[PDB]
Structure 1
């Protein structure tokens, strides 16, 4: 069948559409923003909360649900919109998927469902989100699993908890994008806290490969899987690496930590290896170079 991608104009979604089409799949792309300029492509422009979702899902066997408001920090002060985009739209989409007979829905969830854990975050750990954004992504994934559990549903859900994704095309509000502009263009970036916080930074090419594997693995019911590298790097170390790669001093200013940001993320990578055969291939130094090079050419 054909594949539908929500959030297809965004950072991860646009890369996914490209790979799905390259692999021969007919893609239906849904987003309220325009798509950037072998399988066919139909662009459906509109809001998940306004579109006739059942109509959008005709002949669709697999849905990749990537649409969301994704920023951790604005979620404290924009909560109605985060609920509307991240939770209500998910419920409407899942109901439409039951009605349209979709077979598989892969939902983008987030490492922010774990909250503030030291060391390795495993899919059997209790979610303890520290931001309203993390709560909305937890609610979206739990809702998707509740729909898959209905006795009238013939669908399975793959809930993929991605870890801080970067690379060519990264959303411009994320740290690595801002730091690259602070280096190549001298546009200052604020470091929120002392920079010792850590992230498991995962390159978008590995995330898209994991998504493709969920489009293809044999059906074994629903699953919750971390998609990350298992290696965490500090903000200060990313700054140093960027200075080294470019021979330009990043324009940084240290400022106050932002409530809701967790101190460290690190994925347990074992379940995705077992279930999908997925292990991330790109480490940060290689990946950071890819993003710097893409950004240069983009400017």
Structure 2
């Protein structure tokens, strides 16, 4: 099966691509415009495969995307390209509106023409799988708002949308566009919403990687506000496996939430990392001593937690890692990958 993937040089995207090439019979054409977020080095031990093809393009460029579809005759699409940085363009567009909304619209129109011009067989098997975030659901009650032993609510596929940031609002919109094209034109679409990913090849400035690296450089490990914030951490390699499962076995018109089956406070994440770093790599003092509390960010969602029961029940997917086993692997990865980290920090990675 040939899978056309957008955002393939990204954090999650690269995990998806590496998975398909290393563990499946499928082939992939990766469409990525390589913004500051893309990294071809994250695909380095896969880019020589004859089952992999790279196309340097912007999903907003219809002409180019149309060409690529016509040339590769994809059996399915996995849409991961997105802008997570909220900017403020002078002239016009803010990249996140352009890429996340207009880009999804643009891609949907190319895929619609392509799909409708297919033959009965290939047309009934085609799938447009849209990758999204749990942030579209808004916020959940926090443990300290609900008093003693009351079972807290979880995000399910029928939880109402309630975006609270420009980024999540832009993703919620792309979600709506994907579902409307299905109901209006009959396009084969599927939508998945996942929680926070962590793991190998995550950029240096991200939360978990930042704690691990600052720890090592003898710098401040920040805990924001009370370290209050609750998030459901999903290991990237697990997300990657769920996504391929969904695109190949997912049912058109369905939605699937994906999560790591856990819930953790930021403070717990920082401490867990320090404990691992004390076990592996011991030193003259505990890494804990660099922990420092810092600024809180205004009206931020207090708790995200996903109920992944549906995907388990219907497709049989469950994470293979636990936060414990996953975090350990992550720390080990950063310790063994200084080169990759340094190329990102120096900018060297943007030279292909």
Structure 1 residue 254, shift from structure 2 partner: 2.0
SS of structure 2 residue aligned to 1:178: helix
1:177 pairs with one of 209, 223, 239? 209
What residue number does 1:112 align with? 135
Q: Deviations over 1:252-287 (max 9, x none)?
A: 432222235311111011111123211122111111
| Contact 1:148/1:156, CA 8 A, preserved across alignment | yes
What residue number does 1:235 align with? 266
| Cα pair distance change 1:171/1:158, threshold 3 Å | farther
Structure 1 residue 89, shift from structure 2 partner: 0.4
| Contact 1:165/1:204, CA 8 A, preserved across alignment | yes
Structure 1 residue 4, shift from structure 2 partner: 0.8
What residue number does 1:97 align with? 111
SS of structure 2 residue aligned to 1:60: coil
What is the Cα-based RMSD across aligned positions, in Å? 1.9
What residue number does 1:266 align with? 305
| Contact 1:25/1:39, CA 8 A, preserved across alignment | no
1:81 pairs with one of 82, 95, 120? 95
Q: Does 1:249 align with 2:261?
A: no
Q: Matches of residues 191-206 of structure 1 in structure 2 within 5 Å?
A: 191-206=223-238
Q: Matches of residues 1-299 of structure 1 in structure 2 within 5 Å?
A: 1-22=1-22, 23-33=24-34, 35-36=40-41, 37=44, 40-50=51-61, 52-58=64-70, 59-71=73-85, 74=86, 80-101=94-115, 103-118=126-141, 119-151=153-185, 153=186, 155-217=187-249, 220-247=251-278, 248-250=286-288, 251-259=290-298, 261-299=300-338
CA–CA separation in structure 2 for the residues paired with 1:43 and 1:93: 17
Structure possessing the higher radius of gyration over alpha carbons: 2
SS of structure 2 residue aligned to 1:159: strand
Normalised by the length of structure 1, the TM-score is: 0.92
CA–CA separation in structure 2 for the residues paired with 1:161 and 1:61: 22
Structure 1 residue 292, shift from structure 2 partner: 0.6
Normalised by the length of structure 2, the TM-score is: 0.78
CA–CA separation in structure 1 for the residues paired with 2:195 and 2:50: 29
CA–CA separation in structure 1 for the residues paired with 2:19 and 2:299: 34
CA–CA separation in structure 2 for the residues paired with 1:167 and 1:296: 12
| Contact 2:127/2:252, CA 8 A, preserved across alignment | no
Structure 1 unaligned residues grouped into runs of 5+: none
SS of structure 1 residue aligned to 2:40: coil
CA–CA separation in structure 2 for the residues paired with 1:8 and 1:260: 32
| Cα pair distance change 1:39/1:252, threshold 3 Å | farther
| Contact 1:131/1:260, CA 8 A, preserved across alignment | no
| Cα pair distance change 1:217/1:298, threshold 3 Å | same
Structure 2 unaligned residues grouped into runs of 5+: 116-122, 142-152, 279-285, 339-352
CA–CA separation in structure 1 for the residues paired with 2:203 and 2:161: 26
CA–CA separation in structure 1 for the residues paired with 2:50 and 2:181: 29
Q: Deviations over 1:107-143 (max 9, x none)?
A: 1110111111124111111111111111111101111
Structure 1 residue 39, shift from structure 2 partner: 6.0
- Give the helix-richer structure, 1 or 2: 2
The total of aligned residue pairs comes to 293
